[PDB]
Ligand binder design. Sequence first.
Ligand SMILES: *[C@@H]1O[C@H](CO)[C@@H](O[C@@H]2O[C@H](CO)[C@@H](O[C@@H]3O[C@H](CO)[C@@H](O)[C@H](O)[C@@H]3O)[C@H](O)[C@H]2NC(C)=O)[C@H](O)[C@H]1NC(C)=O
Ligand SMILES: *[C@@H]1O[C@H](CO)[C@@H](O[C@@H]2O[C@H](CO)[C@@H](O[C@@H]3O[C@H](CO)[C@@H](O)[C@H](O)[C@@H]3O)[C@H](O)[C@H]2NC(C)=O)[C@H](O)[C@H]1NC(C)=O
Ligand SMILES: *[C@@H]1O[C@H](CO)[C@@H](O[C@@H]2O[C@H](CO)[C@@H](O[C@@H]3O[C@H](CO)[C@@H](O)[C@H](O)[C@@H]3O)[C@H](O)[C@H]2NC(C)=O)[C@H](O)[C@H]1NC(C)=O
Ligand SMILES: *[C@@H]1O[C@H](CO)[C@@H](O[C@@H]2O[C@H](CO)[C@@H](O)[C@H](O)[C@H]2NC(C)=O)[C@H](O)[C@H]1NC(C)=O
Length: 170
Amino acid sequence: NNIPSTKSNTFTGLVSLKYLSLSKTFTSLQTLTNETFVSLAHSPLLTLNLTKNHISKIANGTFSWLGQLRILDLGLNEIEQKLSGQEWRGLRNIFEIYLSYNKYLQLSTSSFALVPSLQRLMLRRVALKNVDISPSPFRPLRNLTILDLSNNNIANINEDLLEGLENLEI
RNA sequence: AAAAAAAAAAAAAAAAAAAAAAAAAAAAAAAAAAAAAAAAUUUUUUUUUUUUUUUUUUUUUUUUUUUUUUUUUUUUUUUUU
Ligand SMILES: *[C@@H]1O[C@H](CO)[C@@H](O[C@@H]2O[C@H](CO)[C@@H](O[C@@H]3O[C@H](CO)[C@@H](O)[C@H](O)[C@@H]3O)[C@H](O)[C@H]2NC(C)=O)[C@H](O)[C@H]1NC(C)=O
Ligand SMILES: *[C@@H]1O[C@H](CO)[C@@H](O[C@@H]2O[C@H](CO)[C@@H](O[C@@H]3O[C@H](CO)[C@@H](O)[C@H](O)[C@@H]3O)[C@H](O)[C@H]2NC(C)=O)[C@H](O)[C@H]1NC(C)=O
Ligand SMILES: *[C@@H]1O[C@H](CO)[C@@H](O[C@@H]2O[C@H](CO)[C@@H](O[C@@H]3O[C@H](CO)[C@@H](O)[C@H](O)[C@@H]3O)[C@H](O)[C@H]2NC(C)=O)[C@H](O)[C@H]1NC(C)=O
Ligand SMILES: *[C@@H]1O[C@H](CO)[C@@H](O[C@@H]2O[C@H](CO)[C@@H](O)[C@H](O)[C@H]2NC(C)=O)[C@H](O)[C@H]1NC(C)=O
């Protein structure tokens, strides 16, 4: 679709919505603030698609009202910012994150502290840098099953990465 | 009472010379010191600009294999009004 951007009460009224897809829908959406998905406060979403939406910036607490959201997609996007953990604020029971196909995703030791209940995490060709810092960004995470960091050309790695991750399988 | 000549001693003061020294100031010569400015041999460290080798990410180009839709060039055996 070709909607430029959403409004304050665009999705207001959906009290039972759980499957929402917005792939290749937004063209004027360059920066994601915490006033875009305010309409989905009462919507118990479970899946979310946001591929090909030309998303380049997300603000702190953007998905704060997405407490019941479990699956969200952010692949095939132009995200260029610093991950500090507050981008996933408000995610009570999150399942997995589609965060592949990007151009720059800087990671820090607190980039994933807020959400410790992840199951799958793929970072395919997102050009990740500066990961070998101690402690590892994945210290709070324990329930991951699939971890993909392929096609990223990691500069360095140390022992602190991927230690104690008992639940990993892939 | 006073005045003078040969001849021998002693006391105050002034101007001198020589010798034995001792202090203050001034000149060098040696043995050291503390430094603010200096140069010169050796081994290392930071930063800027660039050289060589190896491993990989993005994009572009060539060749080969395979798959899906359209323009279709044809057809053999039949059907057909
Ligand atoms: C959002 O919508 C898009 C478009 O429908 C969904 O894309 C689909 O994603 C799946 C899984 O990533 C793709 O399946 C995989 O395809 C690859 C080839 O690209 C294949 O090698 C794998 O084995 C697997 O079959 C699927 O092809 C793809 N479809 C399209 C049309 O792109 C996406 O999954 C949606 N996201 C969410 C969270 O709903
Ligand atoms: C959505 O994102 C915006 C942008 O970051 C957030 O605005 C920021 O909110 C914080 C917290 O209120 C502000 O910091 C503090 O605000 C209080 C307000 O009383 C003030 O007294 C403090 O001195 C301090 O400034 C911050 O200034 C503000 N920045 C901007 C540019 O608006 C907003 O809070 C976020 N909303 C949600 C629901 O996450
Ligand atoms: C979104 O949340 C992150 C936190 O996850 C915010 O980053 C935080 O920003 C503050 C303010 O700059 C930082 O405090 C100061 O940081 C400097 C270094 O930049 C440090 O020298 C100071 O002593 C002080 O701690 C804080 O460290 C930083 N935290 C992280 C984890 O990066 C970010 O500002 C928020 N953005 C918005 C728009 O609300
Ligand atoms: C990590 O995964 C485990 C296993 O799925 C979670 O343990 C389950 O948690 C749910 C909800 O709290 C309970 O209903 C189940 O009975 C638990 N199962 C077991 C075997 O313990 C655990 O909660 C997850 N951790 C986090 C932080 O989400």
